[PDB]
Amino acid sequence: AIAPVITIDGPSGAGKGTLCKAMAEALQWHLLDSGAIYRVLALAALHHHVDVASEDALVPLASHLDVRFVSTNGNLEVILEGEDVSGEIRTQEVANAASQVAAFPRVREALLRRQRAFRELPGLIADGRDMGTVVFPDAPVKIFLDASSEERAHRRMLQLQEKGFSVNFERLLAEIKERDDRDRNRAVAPLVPAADALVLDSTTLSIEQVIEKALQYARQKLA
């Protein structure tokens, strides 16, 4: 309950993950990739044949979901039912399925405790959509990392090409656009910056610049 927390909310592909890892390292604080949980759940639904369009069927899945995260030894390691799925949850599908699953209010609430349990001394950087607005309301440090949707798409495309996957800009743009709209239009706990959240727009800023500003702001408020 009583422990500092830095929330980093923002749309898809805004670089929250990186920014979260970089700050966790610079502060030797714990990390929480909330998206990973939603993605893990969606992967459980697929394996256990649970209808992703059914709130009733997802709830029992959510409350009894056996997940597990291991310390970022250079990377994150997601474990479902004792099986490293770290790569499988990083596909487009799952990502689409996590959005879908994420829309049901009853589901989110059934996951509330698991996320809040990451709040431990000395600190916790929390990456998600509603960390600063629902999950940890009283966070002393709230950042809303964002960009234009065109930029985030270009970055995503360039990242895919690095790994050698075919790409299309138009398509990718429509992929995230849909994703955000869903997470933004959602009647319960939608994407939206907390009033006291610092809006970080990284459109023209390099990666180091983002970290630089994020850390400057954090250290200031946390003394």
Ligand X SMILES: Nc1ccn([C@H]2C[C@H](O)[C@@H](COP(=O)(O)O)O2)c(=O)n1
Q: 201 to 220, contacts with ligand X by CB under 6 A?
A: none
Q: Which of 99, 133, 149, 202 binds ligand X (CB under 6 A)?
A: 99
User: Is 13 known as a binding-site position?
Assistant: yes
> Within a 13 Å sphere around the CA of 59, how many CA atoms are in the beta-carbon half?
7
Q: Which of 5, 179, 193, 200 binds ligand X (CB under 6 A)?
A: 179
Phi-psi region of 193 (alpha: psi -120 to 50; beta: other; left: phi over 0): beta
Q: Judged by CB under 6 A, does residue 98 bind ligand X?
A: yes
Cα dihedral across residues 22, 25, 29, 34: positive or negative:
positive
Distance CA 61, CA 97 (A): 14
Of the listed pieces 35-43, 64-72, 149-157, 200-208, which binds ligand X according to CB under 6 A? 35-43
- Kindly report whether the peptide bond that precedes residue 4 is cis, defined as omega within 30 degrees of 0: no
Tokens of 172: 């990718």
Q: Judged by CB under 6 A, does residue 39 bind ligand X?
A: yes
User: Is 15 known as a binding-site position?
Assistant: yes
Of the listed pieces 58-66, 75-83, 92-100, 145-153, which binds ligand X according to CB under 6 A? 92-100
- Comparing every residue's Cβ against ligand X, the nearest one is 35
Distance CA 33, CA 126 (A): 7
Distance CA 139, CA 132 (A): 6
Q: Which is nearer to ligand X, 4 or 35 (CB)?
A: 35
Q: Which is nearer to ligand X, 101 or 211 (CB)?
A: 101
Residues found near ligand X in the complex (CB under 6 A): 12, 34-35, 38-39, 95, 98-99, 102, 128-130, 179, 183
